[PDB]
Design a protein around this ligand. Sequence first.
Ligand SMILES: Nc1ncnc2c1ncn2[C@@H]1O[C@H](COP(=O)(O)OP(=O)(O)OP(O)(O)=S)[C@@H](O)[C@H]1O
Lengths: 342, 106
Amino acid sequence: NDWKSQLRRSATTQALKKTTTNAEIILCNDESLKGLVQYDAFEKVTKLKRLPYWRSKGDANYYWADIDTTHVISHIDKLYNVQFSRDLIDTVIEKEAYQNRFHPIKSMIESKSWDGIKRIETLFIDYLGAEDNHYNREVTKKWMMGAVARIYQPGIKYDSMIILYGGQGVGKSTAVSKLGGHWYNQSIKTFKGDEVYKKLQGSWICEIEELSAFQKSTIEDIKGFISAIVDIYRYGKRTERHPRQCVFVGTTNNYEFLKDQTGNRRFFPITTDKNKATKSPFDDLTPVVVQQMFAEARVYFDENPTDKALLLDKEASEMALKVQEAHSEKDALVGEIEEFLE
Amino acid sequence: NDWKSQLRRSATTQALKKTTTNAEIILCNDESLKGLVQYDAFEKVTKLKRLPYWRSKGDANYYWADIDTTHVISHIDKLYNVQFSRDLIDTVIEKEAYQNRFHPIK
Ligand SMILES: Nc1ncnc2c1ncn2[C@@H]1O[C@H](COP(=O)(O)OP(=O)(O)OP(O)(O)=S)[C@@H](O)[C@H]1O
């Protein structure tokens, strides 16, 4: 039977009422408008399930826009003699998308289960020529667990940050981009203010690249930025974007990038070398392998879904202290004073 | 008496009027909307007492957002064909939360 009988029309006039349920029925039953919106939960936006009939065949812009609302209103009014306000149609579209919501990262991580291969520990070791050290394995594993935890337990306490040191072409940025995929982000250069939290909307793995030496202020800025676990933005209810799914990785050119003693214990440097990388990050980091690595991280984190499980091992942390001292400025004056005292 | 008989209905046209008392009665006496908001007195925001039926079970987000008001308006319209305003529903939600206000630290 036709769905027209479901529409609520005014008894006196037998004309459709400009009502939320009428719009819901039309959007969920009209052939031209049937199920062409969905909710990108990670990006917190309204994407298109399919191209509507008012777009070009090869537009490749799968985001709902204002003119899509214009065309929806025009089509509804053309077929059905009811003129819906733009606010009502936007509200109905938002609700319908939220009903058909999905998570792309949660889909990819669970796209395929994890067989036993143990890829999480040798992420940057065999791809960027790092050292087969306990600290490297532990911190890379904990970083991948932190990434998948921020995906699954969105608002979580994970203030650590892998920092990769290497030459101009060791492929650290390439490897980070391969890991991030569509949700990799590098277009973040300032870290203090309010609008920065808007730049994190569709980003999962955010990379901070240090070409020239950062100023003393920028290090404190990135500390206070990665230390946050919540973001606040905005048309009512203040829409506190609590999740903060982002996980941060830095890529530095200078060997000695640590200046303050405050920043230590949170920046976990890894020294990447070339000619010793078993697998080329330009050819071997494929979506299948990174998906399997994230599935392995999911398994390990789900073995203990807690922020305390994202912290390093005790001996791993104590020798991370040694690494952080080996990557910091020396101040060169304690030795001279020691010689004077001796 | 059934709570639906308390609703103030326009005697001329036998339709519910978009008044604040009707919204308050519906929110206080609807199983899908019975007492799902509260007011945090420390951080001045409205939070969720429980999880509404339109939210995923593994949500862990307890901030009342615009989509929650959208779903409240849509559900009230579906059940009682009233079509309350966005601002009126926000006002009634805020009043209901303030009726169940709390201080988290206290
Ligand atoms: N097949 C390849 N594809 C891409 N880049 C390649 C390839 N072979 C060599 N390269 C070089 O590898 C480097 C790629 O590094 P990038 O990821 O762009 O940046 P990076 O490695 O992080 O170095 P910096 O210090 O951050 S600029 C470039 O210098 C390329 O010229």
